[PDB]
Amino acid sequence: EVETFAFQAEIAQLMSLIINTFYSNKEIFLRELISNSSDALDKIRYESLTDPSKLDSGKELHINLIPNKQDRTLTIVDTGIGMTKADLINNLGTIAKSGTKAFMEALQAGADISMIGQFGVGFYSAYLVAEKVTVITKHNDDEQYAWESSAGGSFTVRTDTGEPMGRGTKVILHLKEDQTEYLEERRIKEIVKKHSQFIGYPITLFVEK
Ligand SMILES: CCN1CCN(c2ccccc2CO)CC1
């Protein structure tokens, strides 16, 4: 049972702007997704400060980067607070309508695409490198759900019958054919060191056979 939703008009515009604008500094997508994961981990940590049982679904607070050349995917896993179904539908927990409005007003005022994270819609920079994005997520108060979109104005939401996560969010980027450099270890390492050197959680870059 798959439900299909239309993006709000402003978010569909933001996505086609990211997909069609010529912009060479595509590596900022990883900084934005790691920063989103750090925010989600800060949230479950703060909640656990007054209620330790919120960590019953997993005490470790971390971020994993998993490249897979066979599937042409780069996956960013965090054990943060996760997202409910309502959150997923509501633009993955962001204020994406007013965020897009401020971002686009800033673009015409001298900003560039790399500043997207300052307007709360950094997740969508995933479409700088990915043709399709799958988000698997588990919040303590809800079941495990899968969100998916290849842009084009719509996304789907379904109950995820896959591997149980415990708690957190998994962003799977199905990379464009000419963006496979972001599957190479030394390239990911260079980008993490350049843009995410001070993240307060351990970032583990997995290797392949
Ligand atoms: C402001 C609300 N936050 C909700 C959680 N976030 C998020 C969004 C998209 C994918 C993955 C994650 C977390 O890993 C960051 C934004």
Distance CA(59)–CA(64), nearest Å, equals 15
Atom of ligand 1 lying closest to residue 95 CA: 1
Strands (E), 140-192: 145-149, 154-159, 168-175
Inter-residue contact 60 to 79 (CB < 8 Å): yes
Helix (H) / strand (E) element for 116: namely none
DSSP state of 197: T
Deposited resolution, Å: 2.2
What are the residue ranges of helices labelled H in the chain? 9-20, 28-50, 85-89, 96-107, 185-195
Ligand 1 centre to CA of 93 (Å) is 6
Atom of ligand 1 lying closest to residue 135 CA: 10
Inter-residue contact 89 to 157 (CB < 8 Å): yes
Q: How far is CA 91 from CA 20, 65, 134, in A?
A: 21, 23, 13
Ligand 1 centre to CA of 24 (Å) is 25
DSSP state of 8: P
**Is beta strand 203-205 parallel, antiparallel or unpaired with respect to 63-68?**
parallel
The Cβ of residue 74 has, within 10 Å, a number of other Cβ atoms equal to: 26
Exp. method: X-ray
- If phi > 0 it is left, if psi is from -120 to 50 it is alpha, else beta; for residue 151 that is left
Record: fold of 3-205: Heat Shock Protein 90 (3.30.565)
Domain ranges, ordered by start, for the chain: 3-205
Q: Output the six-digit token pair for 11.
A: 């978010």
SS3 assignment for 10-56: HHHHHHHHHHHCCCCCCCHHHHHHHHHHHHHHHHHHHHHHHCHHHHC
- Residues having CB closer than 6 A to ligand 1 are 36-37, 39-40, 78, 80, 83, 92-94, 123, 135, 169, 171
Residue ranges of the annotated binding site for ATP are 36, 78, 97, 123
Residue ranges of the annotated binding site are 36, 78, 97, 123
The Cβ of residue 109 has, within 10 Å, a number of other Cβ atoms equal to: 7
Ligand 1 centre to CA of 14 (Å) is 17
